[PDB]
Amino acid sequence: LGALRRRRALFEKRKRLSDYALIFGMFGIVVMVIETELSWGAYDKASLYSLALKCLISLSTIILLGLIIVYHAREIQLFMVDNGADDWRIAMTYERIFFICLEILVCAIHPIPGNYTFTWTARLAFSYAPSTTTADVDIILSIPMFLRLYLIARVMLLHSKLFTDASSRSIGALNKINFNTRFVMKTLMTICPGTVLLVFSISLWIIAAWTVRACERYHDQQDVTSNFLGAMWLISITFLSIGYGDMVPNTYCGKGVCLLTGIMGAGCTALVVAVVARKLELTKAEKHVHNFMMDIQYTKEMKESAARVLQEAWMFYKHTRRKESHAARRHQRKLLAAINAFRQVRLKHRKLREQVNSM
Amino acid sequence: LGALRRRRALFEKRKRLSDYALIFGMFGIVVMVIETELSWGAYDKASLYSLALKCLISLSTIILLGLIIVYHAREIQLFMVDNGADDWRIAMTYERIFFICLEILVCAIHPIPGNYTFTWTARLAFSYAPSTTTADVDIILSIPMFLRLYLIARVMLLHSKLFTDASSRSIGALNKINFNTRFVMKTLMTICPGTVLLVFSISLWIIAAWTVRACERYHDQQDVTSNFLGAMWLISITFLSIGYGDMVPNTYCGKGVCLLTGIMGAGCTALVVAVVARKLELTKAEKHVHNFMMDIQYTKEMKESAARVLQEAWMFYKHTRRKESHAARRHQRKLLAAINAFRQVRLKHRKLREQVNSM
Amino acid sequence: LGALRRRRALFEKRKRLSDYALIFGMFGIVVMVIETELSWGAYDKASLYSLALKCLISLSTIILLGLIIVYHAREIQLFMVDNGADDWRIAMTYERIFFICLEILVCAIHPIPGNYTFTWTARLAFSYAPSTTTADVDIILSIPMFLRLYLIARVMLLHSKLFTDASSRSIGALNKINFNTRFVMKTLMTICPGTVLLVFSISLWIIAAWTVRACERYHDQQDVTSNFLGAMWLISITFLSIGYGDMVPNTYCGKGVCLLTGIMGAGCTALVVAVVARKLELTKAEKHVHNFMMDIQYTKEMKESAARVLQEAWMFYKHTRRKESHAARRHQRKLLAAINAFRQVRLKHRKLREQVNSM
Amino acid sequence: LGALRRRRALFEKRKRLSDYALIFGMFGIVVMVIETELSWGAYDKASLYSLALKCLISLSTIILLGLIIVYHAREIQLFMVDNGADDWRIAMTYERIFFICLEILVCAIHPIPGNYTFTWTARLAFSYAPSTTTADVDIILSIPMFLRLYLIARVMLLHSKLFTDASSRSIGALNKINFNTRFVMKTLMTICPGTVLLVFSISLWIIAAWTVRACERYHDQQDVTSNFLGAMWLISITFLSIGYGDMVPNTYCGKGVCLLTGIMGAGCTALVVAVVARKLELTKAEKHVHNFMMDIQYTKEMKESAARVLQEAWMFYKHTRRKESHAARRHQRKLLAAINAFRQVRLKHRKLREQVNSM
Amino acid sequence: QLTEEQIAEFKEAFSLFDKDGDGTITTKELGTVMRSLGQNPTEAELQDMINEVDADGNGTIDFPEFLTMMARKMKDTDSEEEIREAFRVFDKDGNGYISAAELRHVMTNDEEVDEMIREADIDGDGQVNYEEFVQMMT
Amino acid sequence: QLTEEQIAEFKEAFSLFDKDGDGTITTKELGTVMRSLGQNPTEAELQDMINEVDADGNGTIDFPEFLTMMARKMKDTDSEEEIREAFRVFDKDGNGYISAAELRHVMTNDEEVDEMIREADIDGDGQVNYEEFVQMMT
Amino acid sequence: QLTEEQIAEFKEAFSLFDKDGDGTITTKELGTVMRSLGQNPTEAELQDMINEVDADGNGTIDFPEFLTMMARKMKDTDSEEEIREAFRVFDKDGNGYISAAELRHVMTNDEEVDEMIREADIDGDGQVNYEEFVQMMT
Amino acid sequence: QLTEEQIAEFKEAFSLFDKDGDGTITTKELGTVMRSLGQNPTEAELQDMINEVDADGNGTIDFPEFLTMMARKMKDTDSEEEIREAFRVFDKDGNGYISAAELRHVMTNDEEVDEMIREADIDGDGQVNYEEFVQMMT
Numbered sequence A, B, C, D: 001l002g003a004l005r006r007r008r009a010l011f012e013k014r015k016r017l018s019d020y021a022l023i024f025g026m027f028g029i030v031v032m033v034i035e036t037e038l039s040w041g042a043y044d045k046a047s048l049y050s051l052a053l054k055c056l057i058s059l060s061t062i063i064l065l066g067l068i069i070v071y072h073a074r075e076i077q078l079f080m081v082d083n084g085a086d087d088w089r090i091a092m093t094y095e096r097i098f099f100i101c102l103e104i105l106v107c108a109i110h111p112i113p114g115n116y117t118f119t120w121t122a123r124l125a126f127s128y129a130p131s132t133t134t135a136d137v138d139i140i141l142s143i144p145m146f147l148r149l150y151l152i153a154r155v156m157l158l159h160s161k162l163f164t165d166a167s168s169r170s171i172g173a174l175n176k177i178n179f180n181t182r183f184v185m186k187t188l189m190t191i192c193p194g195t196v197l198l199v200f201s202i203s204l205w206i207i208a209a210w211t212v213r214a215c216e217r218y219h220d221q222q223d224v225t226s227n228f229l230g231a232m233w234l235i236s237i238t239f240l241s242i243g244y245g246d247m248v249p250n251t252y253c254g255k256g257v258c259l260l261t262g263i264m265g266a267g268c269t270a271l272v273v274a275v276v277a278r279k280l281e282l283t284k285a286e287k288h289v290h291n292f293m294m295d296i297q298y299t300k301e302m303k304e305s306a307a308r309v310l311q312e313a314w315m316f317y318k319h320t321r322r323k324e325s326h327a328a329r330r331h332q333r334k335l336l337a338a339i340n341a342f343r344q345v346r347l348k349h350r351k352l353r354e355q356v357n358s359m
Numbered sequence E, F, G, H: 001q002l003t004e005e006q007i008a009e010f011k012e013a014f015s016l017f018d019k020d021g022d023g024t025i026t027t028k029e030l031g032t033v034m035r036s037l038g039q040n041p042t043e044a045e046l047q048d049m050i051n052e053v054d055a056d057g058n059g060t061i062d063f064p065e066f067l068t069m070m071a072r073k074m075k076d077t078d079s080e081e082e083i084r085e086a087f088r089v090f091d092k093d094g095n096g097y098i099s100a101a102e103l104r105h106v107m108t109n110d111e112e113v114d115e116m117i118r119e120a121d122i123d124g125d126g127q128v129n130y131e132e133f134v135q136m137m138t
């Protein structure tokens, strides 16, 4: 009784902290995208604008790590209430220790304020001529910031009604259904598989094309892959497994992203073509009407084919009585074609009769 | 009663206007293809022939927009009769306003008479050397004219018997089937999926290969992708997801069309191989005969395998009585092979017995 | 009665002529392969060896056209017996006229003796530099000679027992099965789909790789695609839809063959992976044993998981009685892990119970 | 009785020799990888280190061939006990002779100590410029040493409980299940298909990428494919069938490995996407709960849609009584949208009712 | 009246629904047609739906009856059917009459509903019936 | 007469259709064979099919009769069965006879059909039967 | 007490489990709900599970009863149910009392088990029951 | 005798085949185990197969009999079962005795078969039985 009030109060606290972790997680990503794009041409890494925006990212990282710590503290309190424990140490299992530190490590990677540079040497594409540049270290930290998109999966899980409803929990309990993040994803692939596979593809299309562009701008002076629409074409053709054309990443960051694009592009392509294949198939009710209408059409076609069989049969006989040779043979040839066409419509009608009886 | 006469009269008016919108829609496309091809070498954009043919396109656009307006006016009258309303304003919903304007916008894009030019700068393929030309603006308007092919989907929908028959409407009503453009497409994929996927593929093969050629002729002086058979090979290999080879679009128009080719080429390839897979499978009646014949063959093979088991068994025993060693061992080795071959034919026969019992 | 003797006599005449048409059809292909390969380096088109071998091909074409005419004459006599007609003109339908002429046209294309040459101009690959050569016209006629491989489909059809057995014809008649070339192919894809798809792939692998090599030797002075192992790699990677690499056909013959390779390589790849997927699946009997064994394993695992639940529960209680804190908490943490592991093995066991009940 | 003791004693002898054949088989491979990598830069083929490590490989080949001979000798004794024979010659069938010699031939290929060299001439990629080098013959023998990985399949087969349990053998006997290497692989693809297809892919990813690197280092002075991360990218993109980019093998060894990568990459890709598709599908119990919850949601949505139908109906009537025109028409338009939305929720609810009744 | 082609099409549909050709659609024929469509209609609901269009109450569908049903049905959306289904969704008790408390219950998913009830009770029987619902809808 | 191989194969087929080996294909054996083919033949339909080739009318199938059935069915398409099925689908009433009005009806999917009917009724009974249908066919 | 929103949610769940609205979950309603989930529960096990939360023993589930069941069940893993299932696994004989012999048998998958049995026998009846098992677990 | 490990494995297999633990595999237990494997064995064939290894003929399988069955069965191929199945294939009449004419018929898929029959008839009863077949096979 009192556990229900505490559990539902911690559910709303965890849900509220997940939203705030998403607000600051995506704010840091948005500012990182702006800062990376602007610091290329608009200003430099040593400008006061670079320090100001990178301090905004760092401040949002401190807040995000604060909300991750507090959210995992609510998971400890929820664990103690769920399992009846009263000591927080009991909840601190090796699996939980690893994942709390893993989320902190993922969310603590950001472009630390201050200009630090490292020597980037990459082998150019289609020419194999090495090119070296003094790229900033903040590109090694801007790209991993996209790992914060896992907070979207947490917000969706904590906001789904199947995870926070009393009726869903009771009904699922009677069938012993494990309600977790996998179940919500599986149900999302049955309600709206097309929308899930389209908001996923056309969102990481820009995320990956920007990651390739932001990585292949230090090693691209010809505006080939550093172009946004060039990288959007590269990521799309690699997604569809068509190829690379002349657009091959000159860095192992672009090659790596074109590898994750090809991996998720071998699965998402198969799942999309398996969804558009389930939407072009007649339902159980629609197929019954279609086979009902084709039975009427085949019934009429059998009448007209058998009528042709008899019509050409009488033409053969009448011309035979008229002692004709060329005309009688022409209608005899037509009689065999009428009989063959009558057999064809009879066989394809019985193919329908076996089809209606199968279901 | 009186509604049936009005509905069936507006059905024939809508169907007649759909045909005329297709005649002028495809006439403009045919003249656009001729005008684009001829104005490259035969004449120039400032010639009187260019003005005469582009005035034919513009005149056919005025007629097409007239028939689109009148057809949508018949849809208003049909809506008023269907829903019992007597005022046209009731039918004017936001969804209908958007689609009426969308069709007008789609059908109003055409090569407006008069020579206007814009600077086209594209990055060449496999060399990354920029190439600039003064391409005419009528190529930005000729390509979108292929969006008028949606009128084919309207003509097919309004001409299908399942959409205009009293028996189909009554039977579908008893099962609450929604008769629309999606239902007709789903039924077309069950009657003749191969023909639908072949008239679709081998028609946009030329439409896309001409679009790539017409776009990559301003930026192609080596006759690589501007060639029609070069662009037909490019679109086919991109459709099959093989790659680009040396044939990579030098413009974002060719890259875009090679992207839509790769998208519809990842779906149409999967649907075609799923159709040719349903035509190599034995039907319910054919499989019964095949398993009936294999049961007779396996029954005979068991007699001959068991006969080999007994024949080699007696050869072993007779040679043993004859005190032979090499011959007795050779037939003993043959006896184990006869027994193993008899076990194999017995197992594969029972694999058939379980197969006939499963269905 | 007398019709059965005549039909079975014409069956053996048609079967004998199909074999002889295959002997001379494949003899001409074998001699064409030898003549094409040898006339490149061993001799020239004007040598007496070229005339002698091309006269062997032409002579075998005359015999092949003779056996095609006689075989189609036996089909006329078989048609007259089957349909009760006594005049050959009745059998001469438009479909039969077209196919008799089509087979003659297919089998009459060969390297006519005598040296004739035509100017071959092709755009080289990856450099777009035109290259022109005076290729012989006998390459335009050697490649279409591979269309004679359709005689293999006729020999297989006429030799299959399902097409020439009295028991198969009677059993198929009771189920109204249409015995034709499609039925034999469908049954071949159920008995040995792997062998059919392997004798087909690893035979046109050499046929297509030789066709690409024989076409891309006039326009290949760098030994890139004219190499046999280069063309075998090209045809294989295009079959698997990987790409072209540096091996792109410099002629439209190689591009065309790499297009038919990519077409049949999008279907054969899907059918092979759908066959190796049906051979890694447990049969109905094998799955029953596997689920029977996993039920025993899960039953034992539930005993050991519940034993761990009770063992750690007593460790918690005994350490609690001993007034321990660190040890009691460690075993309390182990108790929750034992309970969670006991729930996991209980859920995956019931996943098996629902699995055995489903079938 | 006595046969059971002998069979189970030879089972443990065969299992022990399979493990030792794997220890020395993989020791030779590990030393071969070290020797090949080190002899490139660390020393030369004529150094005493090359002779010492190649003598370690040769010594491990002698031991491996000894354990292969002894293991096949235990298979002879097991054969004699199983089939009741007392003479070893009976077991020596042609199939067994070929496979004993085949395993010896496979396991006897190794880098024989002593420096022997052969002239390697390969056509470079994307430039077609021949490059010749004096590569050692030990690269022709190091690569085939990876064929010793078949001993892993033997160790897994002999260690599986389904192959060595008395309960599994008895239960499988009642259903006449053939227990062999294929059955264990089929069961591994049902228990953990993802783990089998991941330990297989991410193990031959390094095996093939090292094979390509070790082969394309004699003919690669630009560090393109000889790079390990370059060859890992090449093998991955060829596995996914994306293409080659600029990374095309300059040798037929790399082309061959990129061909086996594309072959197993057309099957493993299809099997992985067919496994991740069976893990995103709701189970029988989970689907029952999901359709139970969607029925509750649709029931509530029908109440709110019908309430909107009645609410807007009264707004139409009340405004009609108020003699309003613009407001009455706006609510009449809303009434048709409420009715259409009520029909949509009614149809999608009955789509659910037919779905629950189907299963 | 309808044209000859329309009359022929509707007569072919009627003959499809009328196997014996007596000119009336017996409920058994409608049931067997519905079973041919995969549906499993009980006798009660089949009789209920066959009298929905029954003007004369004879229990069978003659040609003008089926023609009126088609005139109501050939349209993409049938407003009358949707109004009837909304009414059936409303009446949880299933008695065919929707009461004031029931309207209050369905409005939660006070003066306005009171005015609606007052203006809907044309006959002054103290409750809202199907005829009142269809009058308010139109 | 047929060659030894043909006779042997035909006797093999007869053994397929004759499980008990008594030399006659009874109704029960045909029923079991057809059920083994996945079909569900009724007793009346199977009896009608079994006398379709029964020359002597004894109700069972002997070897020469099976030879006649094969001689009819070994061809890709047999015209006799097609003519019989066309006659059957012409028979809306199923009485085995086609009236002049029936012919006029099946011709709409007047003098020519009248002349055809006058030339088809060889026995002059005022109607067309199956033997007249096959005579007009050939 | 729980908030108004939580009370409303649990009441809607209860009404989902209780169709007739009488305020008590009859075993027939639970059985038909379970059958609506594809499961096939027998009357014996259904009655056994409906009395698992039965405090007053009336044979029906009132709103506080279902609320207590939910408080036990809303958590991801139910420790009490897992303890009960482990107990049901232990007693092979199914009599509800676990004896030392089968305990020693399940420990093999001597002094320690003897001490556990001695410390678990709170009532000194010579055997271990479910209450002793749950006391030892907690 | 077999080792302790092997005895334990065979005993756990026997307990898998023997639910009640009485030490004898009742034919009902074998039938329910086979039904658990998806097979549908009739009582006649189940009894026939349960007496195949029944040395003392009590109608049940004790541990030594199941151990002998396993010793005959753990091998990849069972020669005795294959010989028995070949014998069952030979006797189409199903009487358990293969006559000389039957052998002559099965050899076509004269002096040699005569010598085989003469040397196989150890008891001189004029026919070949199962024991003669297994003696000739070995």
Ligand SMILES: O=C(Nc1cccc2nonc12)c1ccc(C(F)(F)F)cc1
Binding pocket: B200, B201, B202, B204, B205, B206, B208, B235, B236, B237, B239, B240, B260, B261, B264, B265, B268, C263
């Ligand atoms: O160019 C092709 N397809 C398409 C291009 C663009 C948009 C499309 N939307 O749908 N298909 C489309 C195509 C290529 C090869 C074949 C072959 F099978 F003949 F090889 C057929 C078609």
Ligand SMILES: O=C(Nc1cccc2nonc12)c1ccc(C(F)(F)F)cc1
Binding pocket: C200, C201, C202, C204, C205, C206, C208, C235, C236, C237, C239, C240, C260, C261, C264, C265, C268, D263
């Ligand atoms: O060249 C090939 N195939 C084909 C080429 C041309 C027309 C065809 N029509 O059908 N297959 C065809 C092939 C490639 C690789 C393999 C591998 F599996 F061994 F890798 C097998 C075959």
Ligand SMILES: [Ca+2]
Binding pocket: E018, E019, E020, E021, E022, E023, E024, E025, E026, E029
């Ligand atoms: Ca009637």
Ligand SMILES: [Ca+2]
Binding pocket: E054, E055, E056, E057, E058, E059, E060, E061, E062, E065
């Ligand atoms: Ca009436």
Ligand SMILES: [Ca+2]
Binding pocket: E091, E092, E093, E094, E095, E096, E097, E098, E099, E102
């Ligand atoms: Ca009411």
Ligand SMILES: [Ca+2]
Binding pocket: E121, E122, E123, E124, E125, E126, E127, E128, E129, E132
């Ligand atoms: Ca009222």
Ligand SMILES: [Ca+2]
Binding pocket: F054, F055, F056, F057, F058, F059, F060, F061, F062, F065
């Ligand atoms: Ca007879």
Ligand SMILES: [Ca+2]
Binding pocket: F091, F092, F093, F094, F095, F096, F097, F098, F099, F102
């Ligand atoms: Ca009649």
Ligand SMILES: [Ca+2]
Binding pocket: F121, F122, F123, F124, F125, F126, F127, F128, F129, F132
């Ligand atoms: Ca007559």
Ligand SMILES: [Ca+2]
Binding pocket: G018, G019, G020, G021, G022, G023, G024, G025, G026, G029
């Ligand atoms: Ca109740």
Ligand SMILES: [Ca+2]
Binding pocket: G054, G055, G056, G057, G058, G059, G060, G061, G062, G065
């Ligand atoms: Ca109670």
Ligand SMILES: [Ca+2]
Binding pocket: G090, G091, G092, G093, G094, G095, G096, G097, G098, G099, G102
């Ligand atoms: Ca007990």
Ligand SMILES: [Ca+2]
Binding pocket: G121, G122, G123, G124, G125, G126, G127, G128, G129, G132
């Ligand atoms: Ca106790």
Ligand SMILES: [Ca+2]
Binding pocket: H018, H019, H020, H021, H022, H023, H024, H025, H026, H029
């Ligand atoms: Ca027992």
Ligand SMILES: [Ca+2]
Binding pocket: H054, H055, H056, H057, H058, H059, H060, H061, H062, H065
């Ligand atoms: Ca016994």
Ligand SMILES: [Ca+2]
Binding pocket: H091, H092, H093, H094, H095, H096, H097, H098, H099, H102
């Ligand atoms: Ca006998």
